[PDB]
Design a protein around this ligand. Sequence first.
Ligand code: FAD
Length: 383
Amino acid sequence: KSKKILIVGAGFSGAVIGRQLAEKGHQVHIIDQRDHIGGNSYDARDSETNVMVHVYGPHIFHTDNETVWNYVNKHAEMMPYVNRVKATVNGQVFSLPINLHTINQFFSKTCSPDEARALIAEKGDSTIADPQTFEEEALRFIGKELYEAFFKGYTIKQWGMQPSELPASILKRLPVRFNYDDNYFNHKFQGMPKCGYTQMIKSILNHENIKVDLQREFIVEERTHYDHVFYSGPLDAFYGYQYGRLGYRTLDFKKFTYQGDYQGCAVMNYCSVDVPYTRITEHKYFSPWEQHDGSVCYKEYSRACEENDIPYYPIRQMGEMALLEKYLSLAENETNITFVGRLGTYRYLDMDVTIAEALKTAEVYLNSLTENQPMPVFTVSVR
Ligand SMILES: Cc1cc2nc3c(=O)[nH]c(=O)nc-3n(C[C@H](O)[C@H](O)[C@H](O)COP(=O)(O)OP(=O)(O)OC[C@H]3O[C@@H](n4cnc5c(N)ncnc54)[C@H](O)[C@@H]3O)c2cc1C
């Protein structure tokens, strides 16, 4: 049986599920309300500067999953790229994550790894036996000066919450690296597609059994034309926000163009609340194999996600997870639909994880066909 599949969204979730089913002879119809493919991973070349701009913010590919790595290399030339982040705070510029250079610069010292371990131990606040809060966890781990420099201002700005209002769970481990490695991510596989994520997704979408329609919102009535629907849009939006909006932090990007080199790196964090933007990204630095005279940059601002704002980071506190449960109790009673992705399942997901889940979702659907089994509404736990 060649099934008729409707996929809502042409980001990694919809494209990867689409391709897997298309290759098994299914007739896949992919719609997206936006005027372009790629979802939040979409990139485009700026006309004036020819800079490849990460349209919805910096997207760095990283993974320990060799299957996903092999998958993306089939659809893009992946360029070696190891993301390195700088942070401006206290009138100084530091490397992030906190490492031996950070500590030595911060305290004007010359510590070895072992001396730094001892400096950190004696800086840590050993007054609260069992930290319940994120502020006290941070204080226990790294002490006041480091918590206030790198953690407090950034949490307030990024989450709109005092670290005193967050659980100790947020920080399980001492957030210090006791050497001079300054790679931001620890994953085995790290890289940037040579021609960008959009070209990568276009190659994933490049199959005769995939039809793509852009500038087209999903309409609930449509469901009946298909054997199954894969929905990578917001779970709450699917239900008309009938119980209210699931809480997100939204981002605004102020775009500007500089002649030359604005900041000399891809990402600069601004950890103080005295600075209204969280970070500035200089896109050209994501493509070191290219040279550009003009430079497109983003000042990034974080705020509470309102009406018609694009959702970015899911808050997922006790109130949001409770509201979620109301949507899930509807969702789990639906037939012939699977909710997927960052929006469909209300979770922050990396590109590699998204692709991993999409490949599994398709495998689960395909299995449900062979032995005639009922497709689950979720192929991951969402609670
Ligand atoms: C600011 C930010 C930075 C990130 N940085 C990284 C990073 O550095 N590295 C990394 O690995 N990951 C990063 N991510 C995560 C990455 O963006 C996600 O993994 C990816 O977007 C997941 O893709 P998706 O297809 O599931 O969802 P999306 O990309 O959001 O796709 C959803 C698509 O569905 C469409 N859609 C929604 N509703 C409807 C509807 N009703 N009708 C028709 N179409 C609809 C939308 O237009 C959109 O194209 C970042 C995410 C954000 C938000």
